[model samples]
Target: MARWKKAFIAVSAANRFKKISSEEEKRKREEEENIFEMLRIDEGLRLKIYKDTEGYYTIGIGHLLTKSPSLNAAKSELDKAIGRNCNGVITKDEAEKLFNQDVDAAVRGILRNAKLKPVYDSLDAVRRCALINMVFQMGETGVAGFTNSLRMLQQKRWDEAAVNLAKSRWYNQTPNRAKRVITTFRTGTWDAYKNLGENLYFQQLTEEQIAEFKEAFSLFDKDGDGTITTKELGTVMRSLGQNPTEAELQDMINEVDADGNGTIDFPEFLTMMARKMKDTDSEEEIREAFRVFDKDGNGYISAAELRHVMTNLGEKLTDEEVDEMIREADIDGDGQVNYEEFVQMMTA
Candidate 1:
C-alpha cells in the first residue's frame, strides 16, 4: 500500500509541473500575439509594396523595403497574389512573423541611436511608443534629426519636447501624424489625429530677419567652432556698447544656453538675439506665441503655463523662479501674466 501511494504522489506532482509549464507557455504566446496586434494597429499592415504617406516604399506594418529580405519575399508574394508571377503567396501568418521580426529589429535600431536609449528609457511607456512610432515612420536617422526635441526629453521637459517635436520639418510634412505624436508626448495617450492642420510652434522669421540673425551669430562665433564662448560673447556685448564683465558674460550664456553645454550654439544665440533685436511682434504673432504657452487658450499664463512654456524653450526654472518671472512683468498685478504682460516679458 505504501509503494502504491508513493507512485500516485509522484504522478500527481508531475501533472502539476506539466500544467504550470503549459500555462506559462500559453501566457507568453498570448503576450506575443498582443504585441503583434499592437504593431498592426500602430502601423497598419499591408501585403503589397506601396509607398507610405511620405512616399517611402514600405511593406507589412511600416517595414521599410530598403533592406529586409522579407521585402523581396513580400514583393514576390504580392506579385503571385496579383497573378504577375508564380511565386507562392506569403500567407497572413508568414507576414505577421516577418512583421514581428522587423519590429524587433526596428526597436533595436531606435534604442541604439546615439544618446537615444537613455532618453527613451527615461520616458513612460506611452512616450516610448510614440518615439518608436516615429522611428517606424521615419527611420532612426530621421527621428534623430530632432536634436533639440531629444535634448528636451533628456532634461525631463515633456512640454517643450512635444513643442519641439511639433516644430520640426517632419511636422510640416506630416501635420496629422505629427499632431498625434505631439499629443502622445504631451498627454501620454494615443489620441488619433487625421487632419488637425498646422499648429506651428516656432515663429517664422522673414528672410531679412534670418539673414540678420545668421550674421549676428557668425560674428559672435569668432572661433568658427559653431559655438560662442564667454569671451566671444563678451566681445559681442562690447561691440553692442554694453561691456559686460566676465561674470555677466557667463550669465548671458547661461540664459541662452539651450543644451546647457556652457556655451551658446547658433539656435540658442538666434533665439536670444531675436528677442533682444525684435522691435515688436505683431498682435497676431504675439497671440500665436501666447497660444503656444497658454496651452488651454485661456488668455492668461498662470504659473503652470509659464513653467511649461519656458521649460519647453529649454529654460529650467523652479516654481519660485517662474513666479519671479510673473512678478517682473505682471503689470496688472493679477498674479498672472496676461497676453500683454507675457508679450512684454518676452520682448523685454
Candidate 2:
C-alpha cells in the first residue's frame, strides 16, 4: 500500500536528528558501509573507458579524461592510480584501486583547502565521508565552491544546507545523484530517503502544522464522510475558541467550500490553510501563538491563564512556579504578560 503520511513525511524538511543524536553506537561502522554504497551505487564500475554525460572519457568511478592537462596526462593519471599500464581496459580490482585512490585524493584535497579544512575537521566520520564522496564526484574545488552551504553544513544547519544547494544548476542537472547526495547531507545519517516512496505534496510545513491540520480535519468530518459540512463551521470556531459571529462564520465556511457544495474536502481545507500561511510573524501569527494561553482573548496571559493551559496539556506544576513563569514574562514588572509583554518575552 502506498501510505500517504510516510510519503508526506518522507518529503518533509526535517527529522533523523533524534535517530543520529541519541545513540553512541553504529555510527563508526556505518561510515564505511554507507560510503561504500554511496560510491558503488552512484558511480558503477565500468572496467573500461567510456564517455560520461559531459563527453568526458571517464574511467572507473568518476575519473574524468578532460580534467587532465593532456590526453597523455589523463592516461598517466589513470595508470598511476591503478598501479599498472592501461590498454583501454582494466580489471575489477584495478577499478577498485582507482576508486580508493580517487577517494584518498579528494580527502587530501579537502584538508588542503584553506577554507574547508576546519569545517571538514568538525564533521563526524560518516558526514566527513559524505563530503569526501562529493569531492570525488565534483572535484575538490567544485565542492569547495559551495561556500554558504558548506558553512551551514559545518554549523549543523542541515535543512538550510540542503535548501541552499537545491537552487543550483548542479542539483537540477544531475537529478538522481544530486538528490540522494543532498538528502544525505540534510539528514546526516544513512538509510534515509527515496525508493521509500514517490513524493507526496512537498509542503514546506512544520511537523506540528501537518499534525494539527490532519486532526482538525478528522475531528470535523465526524461521520466518516471525508468532508466537513457547512454546519460544522460554528463548532470549529468554538474549538478554536475564537469569536466567529453569524456573518463571519458564514464567510469562513464559504471561503473553503470550494466546490460550492457547502462542504470542505481535505484538499479544499488545505488550500485555505495554505493561503493563511505567512512568510513573517504577522499579527495573526503572534495572536495564535498567544491564543494558546489567552483562550478568552482577554489580551493578556496571567498566572491562572497559563495554569489552565499547562494543566490542560497535562502538566502538574507547583503553584508558585507557575507564578514564577508569569513573573519572568512580566517585563513591565506589573506581574502580567500583556500582548506587548508576551511579544517582548517571545523576542527574549
Candidate 3:
C-alpha cells in the first residue's frame, strides 16, 4: 500500500535552524551549530532556525514559513507553524513571498557570493523554490554543499540528481519530506506544486482524499475486505520486483500491524510505504528513466539491442551471450521486450 504521509517528507523542504550572531564570522559559526542541533531532533526536519527582521525565528518547510511567531517559540512551534504557513504545501505565492524578502541578497552573501541570475537561471520554479527554502533554513554557507547537486541539475542530469538527492543526510533526516519534493522536481512536476497537492502531509482527510486513500489501500488488500494477509503481502511485493522469504514475509506482517489488530489500517500503510521505498528501486522517476533509455520499438528487449548497448559501453558480447542477455532483460513474462522494458532491465 502507498504510504502517503511518509512519502510527504520526500516532497518537502528540509528542517529548521536559527541565527544568533550579528557579525558575519560569528553568524556562520552560530548557524552551523543551530543546524547541527536541529539534525538531532528527528534526524528529519533538520532545518536551521534563523531570525528574520520581523522579530521571530522561522524555518522554511517546502519554501514556506510560519508567520514569525516570536523567537522564543521557534523551537516548539516550527512544525505546526510551518504546516499552517505553507498553506499545507509549497506554492508560487510562497515563492514570491520568499523572493520579496531579499532572500537572494542573503544567498549571495552566504553561498560564495553567487550571483542571483546565474543561480536563479539554473532553477525552474520548483527547484528555485526548493533552494529558496533551503537558503531560508540554513542561510547560504550552510547549503553550499549542494553545489554539486546544483551542477547536476544545470547539466540536465535529472535522474542522477534525483538519485543523488536522496543519498544526502538531509534525505535521511526527513524521508517523507525530502522524497516528496524531489520526486516532484525530478519528474518536472514542480511547477504544479500548489501545496504539494491536496493529498500529502499528515492530517485528517477530506471525503475525496479519504476515498483516494482507501482506493490505494485496497490495491494491497488482496481479499478486498479491508484486510491484508501474509499471502497477499508477498504477492504484492513479488509483483513489484521483490520476493520476500517466508521468514521475511512474517516479519513484514508483524512490523506492519502496530495495533495487534490482525490487519493494517490507513495510517499503518502510510508508515510502511515510507520505509519500503528506501529498499526498493521503485522511485517515481525510475520508470520514466527506463523509457528514456529503451530506444527500440520492440515490446521486449532483443539480443540485438543488448549487443548494441554493450558495444556502446565499449564492451563486446558474443552472439550466444547476447541471447542470454535478452532473457535477463525480459522482466515481464513475455518472450519479447519493447524499448521501455529493455531499458528498465538494463538499469535494474
Candidate 4:
C-alpha cells in the first residue's frame, strides 16, 4: 500500500475514537448547532404548514409563507409544499439556516427602511448587535414606533433614551431581553459618550450656550435670513452704541466672513464671538474659531487666506511674518495650517 493511503487510513481510524472533553465544552461547541432547538422552544418547529397567531401560513420555526416567496426564488420550496398537500418538511439544519437568514434580513431591512443610518452607525458594536436582535424579534416598524426614544439617543440623552425604551410596549412584551437593550443604550460602552454627542470631535452645546449664541446671531441677523449681510453688520454695531463707519463695517465683515460669501452665517458669527470673548478652552468654541479661519473648508489655512483674514483684522503683516506664523504651527511641514495647527497657534 502507498504511504499516503496508509497514513489516511490511520488518521481516519483515530478520528473514530475522538472524544469531547466535557459537557460544558461540548455544549459551548454546539451552541450554534442548537439554534433550531431554541427556536422550537419559542416558535415551535413544525414540518407541516400551520397557522401562526396572526393567521399567516407558516412552517419551520415561524418562517411565514409570504406572498413573495418567489422574491426569494423559492419556487421549488413552493412546489414541494403543493406536491405534499400544502405541507413541507425541513431538517434541523435547514430550519436553522432559514432562521439565521431571516433574522439578518430583518435587521438590515430595519436599518435601511427607518432612515437610521446615523443612529445605527453611532452605537457601539454591542449596542448595535443588541439593536439588530431587537429588530429581529419585534420587526422594523414595531421598534421604529419609539420615535422619542430614537430622538433621545441622537441627542446623547442615553439615560433618558434608556428610560424611554423601558416604557415601550415591546419592553413589557419581553422585559428580560428588552432590559439588555436598555442597558446597552444607558451605558454606551464608549467613555467619550459622557461629553460627545454624535461625532468624536463634536459636542452638543448646552441650552444656555445655544441661547447665548442665538441671541448674538439674531442681533446681527437683522433681516433674520439666517445670515448677517454687510449692511446688517453696520446697523448692528450702531445699535450696540458703537458708531462704525461703512468702511469700518466692511472691513469687519471682510475679517469675519470666513466663507468669503460677503455674509456671516451663524457659524461664522459664533466663531467671531468666541475669538472676541477669548474663550479658546471650550472645544465647541475653538472648533468654530478654526472653521472661521479655515474659510474654504479645504481643511487648511493658506498664506493668501491667512493674509486676507489678517487684513480684515486690521493687522498689517509682511510676507515673512505670514511664513513665520505658518511655520510656528504647521508641524506637519505642509506649508499651511490645518485645523489642529490653527488651534495650537490660537491657544498659544
Candidate 5:
C-alpha cells in the first residue's frame, strides 16, 4: 500500500468518510496475495502433472487431483485455457486464477473453522496468511484438528503455539519447511521464508555443501537477475570439467525448472544439486570403499591387502574364500584389483 493510504487508515476512525481506508484490506481479503506469494515459491508451479509428497497426482501450483466433479471441472477448464488436451500444460494466468480460487476457499474456510472462529479476526495479515498456508498444505481438516496449538494461537501465546507446532509429526515430515512455519508463528514476520525458504537441502548438510551452491548460483547468475541462463549453466558445468550435449542442458531445465521458465532459479538449482549429489556420491562412495581395502594405497587392492582388510573387518573368511573373492575381482588375471575392476565388480 502507499504511505498515504497507511497514514489515512491510522486515523481513519476520526473522520466519518474514512471508509476508503478499507480498499487495501478489502482487496487483500478478496484477492491481493501479499503472503501467498511465498506460497507460490514454496509450492512451486509446473504446467505438467507430477506426484506430490503424498504420492498424489498434483498439477499446476500444488493443486492435487481427485476423481470428482471438481476434478472434471478443473480438467475441462484447463483444456479450454490451454486450447489443447489437459493431459498437461497451462498458462501462468490460468494457473494463477486456479490458485487464487483455492486460497480464497482456504481463507474463507479458516474464518469459519470452529477452532479458529474466535481468533481469526484478530490476526494480522502475516499470521492470517500463515494459517492459510498451513491450511493449504495440510488439508482444512488437518488444520482444524490441531487442538492445543490452535488454542495457544487463539490465546495469543505465540511461543507456546510455535513450540506446540514443532512437537508434532509435521515437523519431521517436512522438517525444514515446518521449521519455517513454526518460525512464522514465533516471530510473525517474513524473515524465515525470505532467506532460507527455497531450500529442502539447505539443512541437509553442515552448510559447507549447500553454502557452495549459494555462492555458485550468485556468481554464475551473470546478470544477477536471480536466475541462470543456459549459456551460464554451460560455463558452470565446464568449471567442474563436466559438459553436456546440446539437448542435455535443455532437458535438465525442462525437468528441474519448476516454474517452466527457461532459466534456473535458486530453488531449481537446489533440486538439481540434490539430484546430482545422489548420482555423484554413489560413484564416489564406491571409490572410497575400494580405497579402504587398498591399505598400501598402491592403486590396487593386493591379495594380501584384501585378506588383511577383510579379516580386520571381523570377516573370518577361509583362505579359499578370500582367494575366490580376489580371483573374481582381478578380471585381467593380474591377481590384483584395480580401480576400474573394483568399480565394475561392485556394480556387477
Candidate 6:
C-alpha cells in the first residue's frame, strides 16, 4: 500500500517474493514473537549484513572475461605466441605482441558492426578504440548489454544515457570503471577519462575506497600478530573463493607487510585488501605503467598516446576507444605523464 512497499514489491516480485515493509500492515497479518524483523518492519533489528556487492559482481566478471569467445581465442594464440617468443614464459615483448594482436582484432570487430557505426563515426579514433577495447575485455554481449544506453546515445539524451550506461551489468561489474566513464560521458571533461588506469573509479582507487579495503583486511586478520603468515593469508583468500598461485600469495604477503617487517599487522592487511580489490596488479605498479607512455611530460596520458603505447606493446586501440580510455585515466589536473608517471601508467 505504501510507496516504498510498492517499489519493493514491484522490484522484488519480479525476482519472486512479496515483502511487506510496513509495521502496522504486518501486525494486522501475523501473530509471532519476531514477525517484525522477518518482514523488515522494525526500524532497527540491531543486526545487519553489509557486503561489497560491487566486488562480488567484479569477481563474477572474471568468469565472463575468462569465458569470452574472443578472449579464449586470444589466450590460445597468445599461449602459443608466448611459447614461441619467450620459451613459454610470456616476457614483456611477448605480452606486448599478444596484446597488440588482441587490440587489432578488438578494433576490427567493433568497426565491423554497422549499428555501432554512428558511435564509431562520432567518436575520435582514440575513444572508439578504447570503447572497443572495453567491449573486447568486457565482451560484446556485456558492452552491448547496455540496451537503454544505446538508445540514449542515439537520442543525445546525455543525462539519461549516462545513467543507463552506468546501470548496465558491465558498469555494475566494475564500479571504478563505471564512475570514470560516466563522468567522462556526462561532463565532457577530458580529465575524467585521462589515465583511466589510475582512476580510483577505474583501476587506482583514492584513499577513501582503499580505506574500505583496509577495514575488510583488518576484520579478516585472525592473527593478532604484527603480520599475517602464509597460512593465514591462504585461509583468508580461500574463504573469499580465491585460488591464487604461490607467487600471488607471496606478492600479497609482501604488500600486507607494508612496513617491510616481513609480516602484516591488522592495518597492513587492511591496506592490502583495499589495493587487491582494484585488481591482481598493485595500484602503484599500474600507476607506473600509465606514467611510462604519457610522454608529453604531463602528469596524465591522453587516450591517443595511450593507444600508441598500447599498440607498441601489441594492443592496437582504435582511436575512439583510446580517447575514452584516456578520459577515464587522467585523474589529476596535470596532463601527460613524466618518465616515472609514464612507467606507472603503462606498468599497471
State TM-scores per candidate.
Answer: 0.41, 0.43, 0.29, 0.35, 0.45, 0.33
Model 5 has an lDDT value of 0.63
1-348, model 1: which lDDT tens digit per residue? 221122222222222222323444555455455445545655677765667665655666666544434556556545543445524334566567666666567778977877677778888765776777787777788878888888888777879888778778889987866777778778765444322213221118776545545544555575689887888766644533345445445655665687999887877755653452233335544554466556678888787876765443333458797787767768999988788776565452
Worst ten in a row by lDDT for model 4: 12-21
Q: Per-residue CA lDDT of candidate 6, range 8-68, in tens? A: 1122111110111123324423322121111111111111111122331111111111233
lDDT of 2 by residue, 166-226 (tens): 8887788777777777777777665433233242211186766566556546555656688
Q: Kindly report the root-mean-square deviation of model 5 from the true structure over all alpha carbons.
A: 23.8
Instruction: Compare the candidates by TM-score and give the number of the best one.
Output: 5
Tell me the tens digit of each residue's lDDT in model 4 across 36-111: 3333444567765566666656667677766443423333453453453333556666666567666557656866
- Evaluated at residue 329, the lDDT of candidate 2 is 72
Better of 4 and 6 by TM-score: 4
RMSD of 3: 24.2
Tell me which of candidates 3 and 5 scores higher on lDDT.
Answer: 5
Number of colliding residue pairs in each model: 1, 0, 35, 0, 0, 74
- For candidate 3, the 10 contiguous residues with the lowest summed lDDT are 12-21
lDDT of 1 at 199: 20
> In candidate 3, how many Å is residue 83 off?
25
What are the lDDT scores of the predictions, listed in order?
0.60, 0.62, 0.48, 0.56, 0.63, 0.43
- lDDT order, best first, reads 5, 2, 1, 4, 3, 6
Candidate 3 overall lDDT versus native:
0.48
Sort by TM-score, top down from the best = 5, 2, 1, 4, 6, 3
Q: Which model is ahead, 2 or 3, in terms of lDDT? A: 2
The list of candidate 2 runs beyond 4 A from truth reads: 1-33, 65-77, 192-348
Cα shift from native, residue 16, model 3 (Å): 44
